[PDB]
Amino acid sequence: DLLELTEDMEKEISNALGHGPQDEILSSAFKLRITRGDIQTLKNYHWLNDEVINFYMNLLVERNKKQGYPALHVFSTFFYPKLKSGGYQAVKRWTKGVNLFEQEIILVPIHRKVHWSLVVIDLRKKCLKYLDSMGQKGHRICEILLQYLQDESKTKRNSDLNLLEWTHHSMKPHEIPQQLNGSDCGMFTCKYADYISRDKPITFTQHQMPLFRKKMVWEILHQQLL
């Protein structure tokens, strides 16, 4: 959601992006350590890196709990690639201590080459949605993730998913805002995730991305969303 930033905020934001040592840890949580180098990927025209995305994803989980939003599970940005190349066995332990099926919404960030996209698994509707700011379809990706769910369920609950009741859908270019440059794919993924996890229709646009980038640095610095 939109908002007007304050001087004290724009100050600390310029502070974090501005010059200084690269290894200076500016924010720590979820076993992640955001360095000034990492937060600088938020500067306009820069590609977000894994740390920033994972960090933000984890913040959505806490925001949802505290605000009475759907139970949210966010997979690491490294999960999907590991699954795609190593199969279920390679990621069997990435859900240690959690039962995916007791959650309501599962987010799976998709990193392919230099592009970022998003898969949403809504357990409440038994539906998988693929969101891509470059209008791509993700049939195969959803198919691979649905098979992962079946393996997780059979492994952890000794029960099969009822495949006949599950559906998947790739949001068309008209259903969600698209990116108009070559550097905001990571931001679209984060904002898709943000709105989707609150069951809020995705009404933001490319025009608002510069403000989102600034907002996210503050949010990451304070480990709190606006």
Residue-range domains of the chain with CATH: 1-226 (3.40.395.10)
Taking the C-alpha atoms of residue 151 and residue 171, their distance in angstroms, rounded to an integer, is: 26
> Count of alpha carbons within 13 Å of 88, Cβ hemisphere only?
13
Q: Which amino acid is at 89?
A: Q
Query: In sequence order, which residues have a C-beta less than 8 Å from that of residue 136 and are 6 or more positions away?
Result: 117, 130, 170
Nearest to 48 by CA among 141, 185, 171: 185
Taking the C-alpha atoms of residue 139 and residue 156, their distance in angstroms, rounded to an integer, is: 26
Taking the C-alpha atoms of residue 20 and residue 10, their distance in angstroms, rounded to an integer, is: 17
Indicate the burial class of 158 (C-beta count within 10 angstroms; 0-12, 13-18, 19 or more).
exposed
Q: Which amino acid is at 34?
A: I
Active site residue 132: yes
Taking the C-alpha atoms of residue 211 and residue 208, their distance in angstroms, rounded to an integer, is: 6
Catalytic residue among 38, 132, 184, 194: 132
Taking the C-alpha atoms of residue 168 and residue 146, their distance in angstroms, rounded to an integer, is: 9
Catalytic residue among 73, 184, 185, 194: 185
Catalytic residue among 50, 115, 151, 169: 115
Nearest to 61 by CA among 212, 199, 184, 194: 194
Resolution at which this structure was determined, Å: 2.2
Active site residue 115: yes
Can you tell me which residue has the tokens 């925001």?
A: 63
Helix, strand, coil share of the chain (percent; to 5): 45, 15, 40
Can you tell me which residue has the tokens 């691979």?
A: 144
Q: Bridge-partner residues for 108, per DSSP?
A: 119
Elucidation method? X-ray
